[PDB]
Amino acid sequence: GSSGSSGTGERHYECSECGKAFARKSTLIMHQRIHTGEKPSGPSSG
Ligand SMILES: [Zn+2]
Numbered sequence: 001g002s003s004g005s006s007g008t009g010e011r012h013y014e015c016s017e018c019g020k021a022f023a024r025k026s027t028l029i030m031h032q033r034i035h036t037g038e039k040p041s042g043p044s045s046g
Contacts, residue, residue: 013027
């Protein structure tokens with residue numbers, strides 16, 4: 001039925017942005033953030 005390991009379930013989600021493989025799906029999302037942001041600015045301040 002809907003139960004029974006019958007082996008392993010390696011589910012590594014890679015980042016379509018860089019290509020980094022993670023263990024959890026959500027985790028990857030949090031990472032992708034690094035990409036979207038840090039917009040390019042001329043006058044470096046901070
Ligand atoms: Zn990435």
